[PDB]
Design an enzyme around this catalytic site. Structure first.
Site, short mmCIF file in Angstrom:
data_model
loop_
_atom_site.label_atom_id
_atom_site.label_comp_id
_atom_site.label_asym_id
_atom_site.label_seq_id
_atom_site.Cartn_x
_atom_site.Cartn_y
_atom_site.Cartn_z
N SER A 43 36.71 70.41 68.98
CA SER A 43 35.34 69.78 69.65
C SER A 43 34.79 70.46 70.77
CB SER A 43 35.90 68.58 70.38
OG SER A 43 36.28 67.30 69.71
N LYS A 46 30.96 71.26 70.50
CA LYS A 46 29.92 70.18 71.10
C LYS A 46 28.99 70.93 72.16
CE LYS A 46 32.85 66.16 70.17
NZ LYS A 46 33.69 64.86 70.67
N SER A 103 33.97 63.41 75.31
CA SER A 103 34.28 63.93 73.91
C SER A 103 34.07 62.69 72.93
CB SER A 103 35.44 64.74 73.66
OG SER A 103 35.19 65.66 72.68
N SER A 210 40.63 69.39 70.54
CA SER A 210 41.90 69.34 69.85
C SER A 210 41.89 68.78 68.61
CB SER A 210 43.11 68.37 70.75
OG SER A 210 43.41 68.95 72.07
C1 LIG Z 1 37.64 67.43 69.44
O1 LIG Z 1 38.46 68.38 69.41
C2 LIG Z 1 37.95 65.83 69.18
N1 LIG Z 1 38.99 65.83 68.17
C3 LIG Z 1 39.43 64.75 67.12
O2 LIG Z 1 38.53 64.03 66.89
C4 LIG Z 1 40.89 64.75 66.73
N2 LIG Z 1 41.68 64.23 67.36
O3 LIG Z 1 41.21 64.07 68.55
C5 LIG Z 1 42.30 63.28 69.41
C6 LIG Z 1 42.11 63.48 70.94
C7 LIG Z 1 42.07 61.81 69.26
C8 LIG Z 1 43.71 63.40 69.20
O4 LIG Z 1 44.32 62.52 69.16
O5 LIG Z 1 43.93 64.68 69.07
C9 LIG Z 1 41.05 65.15 65.56
C10 LIG Z 1 42.48 65.57 65.18
S1 LIG Z 1 42.48 65.74 63.39
C11 LIG Z 1 40.86 65.49 63.22
N3 LIG Z 1 40.18 65.51 62.22
N4 LIG Z 1 40.28 65.16 64.34
C12 LIG Z 1 38.32 65.25 70.39
C13 LIG Z 1 37.93 63.90 70.43
N5 LIG Z 1 37.85 65.88 71.36
S2 LIG Z 1 38.93 66.18 73.04
O6 LIG Z 1 38.01 66.85 73.70
O7 LIG Z 1 39.25 65.09 73.32
O8 LIG Z 1 39.96 66.95 72.55
#
Ligand SMILES: *C(=O)[C@@H](NC(=O)/C(=N\OC(C)(C)C(=O)O)c1csc(N)n1)[C@H](C)NS(=O)(=O)O
Length: 261
Positions: A43, A46, A103, A210
């Site tokens: 992320s 972004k 995010s 993440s």
């Molecule tokens: C961006 O990095 C984004 N990541 C995801 O959508 C994924 N997981 O996010 C959360 C926070 C829900 C988690 O439990 O790790 C993810 C993991 S595998 C996949 N396809 N996507 C998040 C939302 N951004 S952050 O800035 O909060 O990390």
């Protein structure tokens, strides 16, 4: 031991692969660790999408207030802001804010769709002289973070250089630069990441990410109280798909490289 030795030792203890690029704008010096290696941005990508819309807004005074319809079908895996607006609209500015400060993945997708697809985010990065960044997918698949997959990757150095250009430098006209900085400073998701490795009263703007493979990232601009800004990218990834994320590693790296500043 030296900063380099400290970073190597952190990586050795980490059970993964650490990438760091710090730019000290006081003297243009750098602290680099695997800084030319590719990592999945997750992320942290972004920032580029939001900035691409800000660039467009330079030449379209109505763009940031343009309505975007939010539908139930737009919701994905993580969208705490967009879910509040289903059946209503959000402006492009509000989508930038949600994407960066919460995010919100739906918000990211609306930015990408507005721009005309992931490749248009890549083209915007290229327009900033960043030959390294690539966006290939929408959210959430852009966070799969599979080792060695080039999709949705950049290097720590490329991202630090571009983040500096975006936030402190020549990428955006002033009103737009200022808006990006306001957004980053108001991030809500980064408490335990780079910020946790710094003095509590330093002003920071950051964007986390993440993903799978325990991929745990943060990119930041840091304003010390008595010093010129630092731009810091900390990327971290692990060998196993379901590894836990490790924000503590990012905090530790931040503390190592900002010592003395
Ligand atoms: C961006 O990095 C984004 N990541 C995801 O959508 C994924 N997981 O996010 C959360 C926070 C829900 C988690 O439990 O790790 C993810 C993991 S595998 C996949 N396809 N996507 C998040 C939302 N951004 S952050 O800035 O909060 O990390």
């Amino acid at each position: 031991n030296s900063v380099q030795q400290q970073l190597e030792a952190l990586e050795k203890s980490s059970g993964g692969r650490l990438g760091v690029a710090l730019i000290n704008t006081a003297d243009n010096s750098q602290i680099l660790y695997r800084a030319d290696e590719r990592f999945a941005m997750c992320s942290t990508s972004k920032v580029m999408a939001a900035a691409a819309v800000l660039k467009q807004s330079e030449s379209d005074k109505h763009l940031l207030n343009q309505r975007v319809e939010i539908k139930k079908s737009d919701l994905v895996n993580y969208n705490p802001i967009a879910e509040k607006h289903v059946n209503g609209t959000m402006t492009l500015a509000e989508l930038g804010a949600a994407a960066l400060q919460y995010s919100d993945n739906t918000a990211m997708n609306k930015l990408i769709a507005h721009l005309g697809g992931p490749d248009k985010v890549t083209a915007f990065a290229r327009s900033l002289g960043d030959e390294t960044f690539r966006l290939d997918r929408t959210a959430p698949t852009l966070n799969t973070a599979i080792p060695g997959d080039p999709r949705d990757t950049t290097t720590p150095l490329a991202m630090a250089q571009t983040l500096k250009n975006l936030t402190l430098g020549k990428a955006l006209a002033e009103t737009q630069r200022a808006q990006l900085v306001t957004w980053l400073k108001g991030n809500t998701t980064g408490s335990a990441s780079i910020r946790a490795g710094l003095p509590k009263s330093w002003v920071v703007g950051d964007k986390t990410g993440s993903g799978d493979y325990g991929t745990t990232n943060d990119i930041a601009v840091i304003w010390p109280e008595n010093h010129a800004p630092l731009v810091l990218v900390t990327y971290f990834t692990q060998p196993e798909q379901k590894a836990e994320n490790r924000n503590d590693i990012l905090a530790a790296a931040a503390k190592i490289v900002t010592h003395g500043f």
